[PDB]
Structure 1
Amino acid sequence: PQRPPVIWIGAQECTGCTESLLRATHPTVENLVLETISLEYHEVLSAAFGHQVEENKHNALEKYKGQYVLVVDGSIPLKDNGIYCMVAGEPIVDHIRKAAEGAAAIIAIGSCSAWGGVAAAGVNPTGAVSLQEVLPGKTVINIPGCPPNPHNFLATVAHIITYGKPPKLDDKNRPTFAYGRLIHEHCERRPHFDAGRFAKEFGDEGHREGWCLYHLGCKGPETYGNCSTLQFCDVGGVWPVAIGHPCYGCNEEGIGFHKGIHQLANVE
């Protein structure tokens, strides 16, 4: 029984967005690639290398034209004619634009591909941009986070397969089930915020009672996400704030990698 094809291309990626799949449980990465999809291209896991894997890519783009989901992690560097990422002697922006032509759906997994992320921060040495900026006439589904919970991606792909269309998206093309609400508008430490019960330093008495991390720099008030509800790793209770560290805003353009850890958020 045939599985829906997926082409995965890394640009200026750190591989964290692929590594998120190795923590997934529904599906596990082995069930993803054996049962859920046909992963037609992914350089991290591919048996083939070099000329053989460039054959696989060209064969897949032709065989599955109009049918595959294209996934990109990393930012795409446009400075100096694309040379800050060169694969098989050609700029990765050209590989991505070629793959985009035949895509049924296109997903930017992680903050780097969704909005430029850390690679486009500060002075932006390589002129790194988002996948949507490289594909202006295409609808890019953005799954931000550094990396996102892998199921923010997997349940988006499942919605496409099972129901034949993307999940509902916000005005930044982010799936609403994962990004529809501010973290601070669904955070279990909001009672402590409301009461003025704040950690002032790691290890202080408030910190050691699980009080609100706003005055440590928590960016929950200005970051859309599901980190407080879905959390991470499916063990229960695991997200940065629950472990004792403020949200850094890694989901949200202009917050993560721009504002200092301890810089205070604006509150709506």
Structure 2
Amino acid sequence: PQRPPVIWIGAQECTGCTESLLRATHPTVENLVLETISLEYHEVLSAAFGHQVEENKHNALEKYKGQYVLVVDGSIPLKDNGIYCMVAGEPIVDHIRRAAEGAAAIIAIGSCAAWGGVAAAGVNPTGAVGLQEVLPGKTIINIPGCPPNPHNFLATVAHIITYGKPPKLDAKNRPTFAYGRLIHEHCERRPHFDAGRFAKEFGDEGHREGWCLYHLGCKGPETYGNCSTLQFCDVGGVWPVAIGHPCYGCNEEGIGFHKGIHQLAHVE
């Protein structure tokens, strides 16, 4: 029984998007790689190195042409003809365009790959862009977050494998099961927001009663995601707002890494 092929290329990645798989429970990373998919290429986990691992990549791109899911994490730097990210002597943008040609499906995992993320913030030293900008006229599935809950990625791949097509996507090509609603339109602190019960300073009376974090700079009103419902790490009750810290808007272009932590969001 053959497992569906996946090729994972890292550009300007911090490796947080790969690390998210090590927290997953359904499936666990070991059940992912042994039972669910064949991970044909991944620099972080590959036994093979150098010439031999670039052999595995070439072998897989040919054998599985038209069949593999291409996953990219990290931004793609276009400034100075691609030299801010060089693997085996070539710009990563070239490795990515080559792998994109044979792909059955293409996923941008994380805010860096989805829209440029932190790598493309401020003055954007490397002219970092998101995957859709380097692959115009290809359908990119965007799974943003820094990093996303790994199940936002895994359940997307599972939909492709089980039902033979991608999940339903929004206007930004994000899966609606994970990104269909504002965090603020499904947040358990909304009653505090409605009543004017606000934390003003970490450690204050309102903060210690679990009131709304709007006035500490919560970006939940401007950020699409499932952080308040799916949350993180499958232990229950764990997302940034539950822990006591405002949403930073890491999922959302123009919010995360652009607005200050304590800068107030626009509310619809």
Q: Same fold (TM over 0.5)?
A: yes
How far residue 26 of structure 1 moved from its aligned partner, in angstroms, is: 0.1
Unaligned residue ranges in structure 2 (runs of 5+): none
Provide the rounded CA distance (Å) in 2 between the counterparts of 1:15 and 1:99.
20
Which segments of structure 1 move beyond 3 Å, counting only runs of 4 or more?
Answer: none
Deviation per CA, 1:201-225: give whole Å up to 9, x if none.
Answer: 0000000000000000000000000
Unaligned residue ranges in structure 1 (runs of 5+): none
Provide the rounded CA distance (Å) in 2 between the counterparts of 1:214 and 1:57.
47
How far residue 137 of structure 1 moved from its aligned partner, in angstroms, is: 1.2
SS at match of 2:105: strand
Provide the rounded CA distance (Å) in 2 between the counterparts of 1:16 and 1:23.
11
Deviation per CA, 1:133-166: give whole Å up to 9, x if none.
Answer: 0000100000000000000000000000000000
Provide the rounded CA distance (Å) in 2 between the counterparts of 1:207 and 1:54.
52
Provide the rounded CA distance (Å) in 1 between the counterparts of 2:14 and 2:23.
16
Hey, what does 2:85 align to over in structure 1? 85
How far residue 32 of structure 1 moved from its aligned partner, in angstroms, is: 0.1
**Matched-pair identity in %:** 98
Provide the rounded CA distance (Å) in 2 between the counterparts of 1:72 and 1:61.
15
Provide the rounded CA distance (Å) in 1 between the counterparts of 2:132 and 2:104.
15
Provide the rounded CA distance (Å) in 2 between the counterparts of 1:219 and 1:128.
24
RMSD of aligned C-alpha atoms? Answer: 0.2
Deviation per CA, 1:153-184: give whole Å up to 9, x if none.
Answer: 00000000000000000000000000000000
1:155 equivalenced with 2:155 (yes/no): yes
How far residue 114 of structure 1 moved from its aligned partner, in angstroms, is: 0.1
Hey, what does 2:129 align to over in structure 1? 129
Deviation per CA, 1:58-95: give whole Å up to 9, x if none.
Answer: 00000000000000000000000000000000000000
Hey, what does 2:211 align to over in structure 1? 211
Provide the rounded CA distance (Å) in 2 between the counterparts of 1:233 and 1:218.
21
Provide the rounded CA distance (Å) in 1 between the counterparts of 2:25 and 2:243.
21
Deviation per CA, 1:5-46: give whole Å up to 9, x if none.
Answer: 000000000000000000000000000000000000000000
Hey, what does 1:42 align to over in structure 2? 42
Provide the rounded CA distance (Å) in 1 between the counterparts of 2:137 and 2:34.
33
How many residues end up aligned between the 2 structures?
A: 268
Q: TM-score by structure 2 length?
A: 1.00
SS at match of 1:57: helix
Hey, what does 1:197 align to over in structure 2? 197
Provide the rounded CA distance (Å) in 2 between the counterparts of 1:145 and 1:262.
19
Q: TM-score by structure 1 length?
A: 1.00
How far residue 4 of structure 1 moved from its aligned partner, in angstroms, is: 0.1
Provide the rounded CA distance (Å) in 1 between the counterparts of 2:18 and 2:131.
16
